[PDB]
Amino acid sequence: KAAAIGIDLGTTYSCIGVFQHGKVEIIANDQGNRTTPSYVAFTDTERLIGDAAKNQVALNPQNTVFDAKRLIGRKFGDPVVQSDMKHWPFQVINDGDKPKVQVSYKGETKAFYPEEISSMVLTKMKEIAEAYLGYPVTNAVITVPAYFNDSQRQATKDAGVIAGLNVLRIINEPTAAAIAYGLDRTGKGERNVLIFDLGGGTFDVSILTIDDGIFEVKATAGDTHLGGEDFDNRLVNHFVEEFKRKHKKDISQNKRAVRRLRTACERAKRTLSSSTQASLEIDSLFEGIDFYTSITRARFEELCSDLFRSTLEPVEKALRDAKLDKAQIHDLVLVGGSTRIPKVQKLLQDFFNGRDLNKSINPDEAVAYGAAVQAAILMG
Numbered sequence: 001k002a003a004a005i006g007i008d009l010g011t012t013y014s015c016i017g018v019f020q021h022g023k024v025e026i027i028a029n030d031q032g033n034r035t036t037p038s039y040v041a042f043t044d045t046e047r048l049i050g051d052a053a054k055n056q057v058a059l060n061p062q063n064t065v066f067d068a069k070r071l072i073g074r075k076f077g078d079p080v081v082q083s084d085m086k087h088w089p090f091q092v093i094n095d096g097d098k099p100k101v102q103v104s105y106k107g108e109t110k111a112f113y114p115e116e117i118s119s120m121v122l123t124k125m126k127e128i129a130e131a132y133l134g135y136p137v138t139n140a141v142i143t144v145p146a147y148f149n150d151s152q153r154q155a156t157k158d159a160g161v162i163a164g165l166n167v168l169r170i171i172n173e174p175t176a177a178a179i180a181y182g183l184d185r186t187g188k189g190e191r192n193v194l195i196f197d198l199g200g201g202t203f204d205v206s207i208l209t210i211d212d213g214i215f216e217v218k219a220t221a222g223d224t225h226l227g228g229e230d231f232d233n234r235l236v237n238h239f240v241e242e243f244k245r246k247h248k249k250d251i252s253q254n255k256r257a258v259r260r261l262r263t264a265c266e267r268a269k270r271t272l273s274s275s276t277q278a279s280l281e282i283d284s285l286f287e288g289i290d291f292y293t294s295i296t297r298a299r300f301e302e303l304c305s306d307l308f309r310s311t312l313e314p315v316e317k318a319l320r321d322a323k324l325d326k327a328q329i330h331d332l333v334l335v336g337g338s339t340r341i342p343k344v345q346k347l348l349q350d351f352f353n354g355r356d357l358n359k360s361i362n363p364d365e366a367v368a369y370g371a372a373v374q375a376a377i378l379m380g
């Protein structure tokens with residue numbers, strides 16, 4: 001019997017896992033990456049998904065779709081959709097009060113529902129798993145934010161059905177993270193678990209109370225617009241100014257130069273989580289001028305200080321809403337690729353007065369890890 005898979009369908013990245021050989025296995029893609037961008041590109045000759053899609057975003061911005069999760073299960077007139085649209089390079093249209101992303105594909109103008117774009121991302125995650133398993137996958141557990149309403153959950157489930165998956169269950173992301181650390185097995189009474197999730201585009205704080213396998217969301221807080229994207233932007237602004245000092249030229253109006261710089265900034269940012277410095281070398285960034293420079297971890301922290309600190313207020317709010325004090329929290333769980341930033345970990349630990357942070361499972365893989373566990377449980 002084929003194994004069921006656990007899929008973390010994130011706003012910016014997705015992750016797939018499977019419980020086999022008595023353990024959870026986070027599956028790497030064709031490029032050897034354990035997480036895949038939630039991107040879909042349409043060109044004159046093909047449809048690109050994942051790495052291939054995000055990799056050519058600078059070349060084809062109007063037809064490279066991302067952030068489908070922000071549109072999924074929402075109406076076109078929804079204030080959130082109306083606001084989000086203003087920031088995207090791709091077109092969003094109204095189809096019976098339902099948003100649809102409109103792009104050019106093979107010379108023709110096509111429009112797709114958010115669930116259709118997400119089904120493409122899910123199909124890629126499903127194939128990533130099938131390539132590893134050696135056989136076709138039919139069952140899966142897909143995760144969603146705790147705040148997702150009935151429409152958003154239905155649309156997410158529909159995205160899975162379109163991808164050819166029997167959605168065993170749609171479970172909350174913070175709950176999946178808890179399951180990953182075995183916190184669902186809570187012996188002798190209630191335990192409060194705080195999930196600190198800082199991803200690529202959103203920041204979520206969830207406080208759960210686990211009473212013998214039964215979860216209850218005590219409080220949620222955060223910022224749906226705060227994420228790694230913001231830290232990359234801080235680095236972009238910094239280097240744009242540095243290019244001005246060193247070349248007396250402003251590249252801010254050249255969309256391709258800014259996008260390429262952003263890409264290099266995200267890469268340098270990731271390196272800074274493991275090293276105290278990172279070199280940034282871009283070939284022909286602007287008018288044949290190469291941009292070979294570097295940046296220290298301290299400099300990066302200074303550029304993002306306010307944003308890092310801002311993550312503590314939602315923690316304070318959540319504790320206040322759950323009517324609990326710091327000491328009443330039994331476990332702190334890190335989720336999201338951005339929690340890999342040392343400064344972010346320091347702020348949370350210091351706020352919790354030296355408490356241990358559950359971070360043994362790669363933060364950007366914890367939700368998929370928990371989904372894989374749950375999928376296995378549901379399969380028996």
Ligand SMILES: Nc1ncnc2c1ncn2[C@@H]1O[C@H](COP(=O)(O)OP(=O)(O)O)[C@@H](O)[C@H]1O
Pocket residue numbers: 009010011012013014035198199200201202227228229266269270271273335336337338339340341363364
């Ligand atoms: N080592 C790292 N250091 C800092 N940020 C990282 C690191 N690895 C990944 N990230 C960032 O994590 C974010 C994506 O988080 P992830 O949890 O994988 O996706 P999502 O938020 O969409 O669920 C991106 O902003 C990415 O650059």
Ligand SMILES: [Ca+2]
Pocket residue numbers: 010011173199336
């Ligand atoms: Ca996420």
Ligand SMILES: [Ca+2]
Pocket residue numbers: 225226227229230
């Ligand atoms: Ca932002």
Ligand code: NA
Pocket residue numbers: 008009010011013014015364
């Ligand atoms: Na993710």
Ligand code: NA
Pocket residue numbers: 197198199200201202203204336
């Ligand atoms: Na998040």
